[PDB]
Structure formats: C-alpha cells, structure tokens
Symmetry: C3
Subunit: 142 residues, 3 copies
C-alpha cells in the first residue's frame, strides 16, 4: 500500500521504516522547550494521505519519557482519514513532567495505520437483556 | 453492523457519527468538577452491546486537555465485549492537571469498535531461541 | 494460534485468559515501591514470541490508578514482533501520581496481540491536493 507524505519543508528529516520497528518513528519539526507542568503542541512536520479506508494512530516511544520527560495528553492520537489536506500537519500534544528540550529531528513518537471501524448502526434500546459484568477492578488484583 | 445502545436516561444527549470523525464522540452524563491533581470517574451515560466478537476502545479527544485539563489514567480504555449488562455504564477515568469543570453533554472522549484478538494458546517454553532486540530507546533518538 | 511464553523464573505467577477479559492481565515480577512524581520500570517477568506477523499492545487496567497510583508513561506500549529474545523481558513504565507499592504477582496491566500494519511505500509529494480538515477541536465541544 502507499502513503503520500508531504513534509513541512526541506529541513525536515525524512521518516522511515526500520527492521525492528513495527511502527514508524516521527520527528519534532523544530526545537521545542517545555517547562515542568506545562503543555506544548510539538509539530511533527508531516502531512499525509493514508490509503483509502485507513486511519493512523500515534503513541509515544517507550524512551520518550526517559529522554524527554513528556507524556502524550491524548494517550493515543487518532489521525482521521480526512486529515489529509495540505495544511493538516500532524502534532504530538506533550505535557512535560520535568523541564525539557526537544531538538528538531528527534524521534519522539511512533505511528501506524489501521483500517477504520466499519459503518455501524446505532440501535437505541430500552433494555439490553444481558447479565452485568461490572468493571473498574471487579476481577481484583491477585 | 449494529450496536445496541442504552442511555442512562432521557436527559443524555444522543451520540452521533460525524463525517470527518473516524471514531465516535462520547459525552459527560452529568456536570463534573475536578480539582487540580485529583481523580474522578466521569460517567458517559451509555451502556452498549457490541457486535459479536467485538470490543471497544476509548481515548481522549486531542482537545480534551486543552478544553478540560484532564488526562485519561488508563490511557486507552478497553471495553470488554462482556460489558453489556443493563448497569454496565461506560466511564472515563479522569485525572485533572488543573482545576476543571466538565458540563453535561460535553464531548470529552471518543470510541471505536474492533475485533477482539483471536483465541491463543499460551505455550510455556524454557528458551525462545531468538536474538535479542533490546528495547527502551535501543534505536537511539536522532 | 500460539504465543510462546518464557517466564523470568519459576516463581512468576503464570498469566491467564479469563472469560470476561478480552485482553490478558500481566503481573509485577517483583515488589516495586514508587514515590510520588517519581518513575520506575515495573518488570513484568515474561518474554514472548508472538505468532508470525503479530505485534502486542499493553495498556493499564482501568483499576490500575485506583489500585496502584500509577499512569503508564508511553500510554500504550507497543511490543515489536522482533522483541522475542531470551532477554527481551516486558516492562510497564510507571509514573507515580501518589506514593505507592506494587507487589509481586499483582495484575497491573493488560495486553493483546494484533496484526502489524502492512508494508507501506512512503511516497513523497509536494501537494496532497485535498481539502483541509483541521484538528485540535475543530468540531467543538457541545
Ligand atoms: O495526537 C494527535 C491527534 C490528532 N491529530 C490531528 C489529526 C486528527 O484527525 C485531528 C483531530 O483530532 O487532529 C494529530 O495530529 N495528533
Ligand atoms: O475506560 C474504561 C475502561 C473500562 N471500562 C469498563 C468496561 C470494561 O469492560 C470494564 C473493566 O475494564 O470497565 C470503562 O467503562 N471505561
Ligand atoms: O511498554 C512497553 C513498551 C516497550 N517495551 C519493549 C517492547 C518493545 O519492542 C521495546 C521497545 O519499545 O521495549 C515494553 O516492554 N513495554
Ligand atoms: Mg522504537
Ligand atoms: Mg474529533
Ligand atoms: Mg480487566
């Protein structure tokens, strides 16, 4: 399959697939500094058109916190198939847990593509008619 | 495919598929106020029965931190297929990074369905017999 | 299909599929103690070879915050198919929002497998030529 990728400019480091990475690393489009307990959108310098029927998902790398002291505020970013315009540049919403500096080109998160959920009919019901599972730790801890 | 949806009551705003959203927005079932550095379960006012063989995933919207100053503590909630009883109402576990107010009907997260992983046999081995990949930033940062 | 599992030693509690769990619970391989706003890797005490062409995803349980006071810094861990060496042991990267103790064998997170994304060709383009969707809350909140 093919992904069309448009880089923000010629100074962006090209992304690529590596042998031992099932997801593709994305890169900070510019230097970004963030103070402890502050938030910043980190631009990633790419816009894409994904294959027909696909969305993308973005998560941190396991070393992102170690190297950069940030967490991703939306947990996993969902890039909608429709986010494919010439100005629809991807971003990584970062919250800094310590003072930090991210440099241009640094690999701070990773993405993959996945088929979107199929079309679903939402059928309103008065009663579901199933037994309750419970949740929030119903199965205990041990 | 079909999802059966049972709303908590008649005051819940109905959820909807929108053209440019690959996931479907869910809504606070009531006003919720949360103090900085505190946790609150935000009820979403919906119980669902998903198509056979499917689970659901729930994440924040990208704008949830911006609009509401919260993160989702479990990162991506997994709605088990068995969570389909009449009292199995979905929730969003929120941790506030600043003082916040969420109003009834506010779209604070989003969901999609996905096929559950297949049945797997767990086969205990003494040795895997593969080369080590390493992890936690083994590929570096540049 | 099959997952080969190798435990850190013969005192790790073996992991198991339960009926009402679509994802499989994984356990702390030793007692771990964490202080508030500090970070620690929790070793999960397993190394796996997954079926051919599959990756794994690890996320917290909904009750992990309630039960243990931690968020997962990478949101959802991605376990690369190639992370299947004899020393490639899974971990859960915990950040403590409160002081906390986790005990050997506690179910702190959960995992499932998934098919890796297909091979994709990254095609460099100058213009995508689609209408802009916009993002970061372009659809509002009400
Ligand atoms: O982490 C994220 C989340 C969203 N988006 C964009 C694409 C998506 O379609 C839009 C709405 O969330 O914002 C990103 O670039 N990064
Ligand atoms: O974010 C979450 C995570 C889980 N659940 C429910 C459904 C799931 O089957 C049960 C146990 O995780 O709790 C939620 O409502 N929201
Ligand atoms: O939460 C995580 C994330 C990653 N890894 C391992 C598997 C992966 O292939 C490697 C590099 O991300 O680190 C884990 O054990 N747990
Ligand atoms: Mg990596
Ligand atoms: Mg949206
Ligand atoms: Mg569970």
């Amino acid at each position: 399959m093919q992904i069309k990728i448009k880089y923000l400019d010629e100074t962006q480091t090209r992304i690529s697939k590596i042998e031992q990475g099932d997801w593709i690393d994305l890169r900070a489009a510019e230097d970004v500094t963030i103070k402890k307990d502050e938030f910043k959108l980190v631009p990633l310098g790419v816009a894409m058109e994904l294959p027909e029927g696909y969305e993308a998902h973005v998560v941190p790398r396991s070393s992102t916190y170690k190297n950069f002291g940030v967490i991703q505020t939306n947990s996993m970013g969902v890039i909608d198939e429709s986010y494919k315009g010439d100005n629809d540049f991807w971003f990584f919403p970062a919250y800094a847990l310590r003072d930090t500096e991210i440099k241009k080109g640094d690999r701070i998160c990773q993405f993959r593509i996945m088929k979107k959920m199929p079309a679903v009919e939402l059928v309103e019901v008065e009663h579901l008619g199933n037994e309750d599972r419970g949740g929030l730790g119903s199965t205990g801890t041990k």
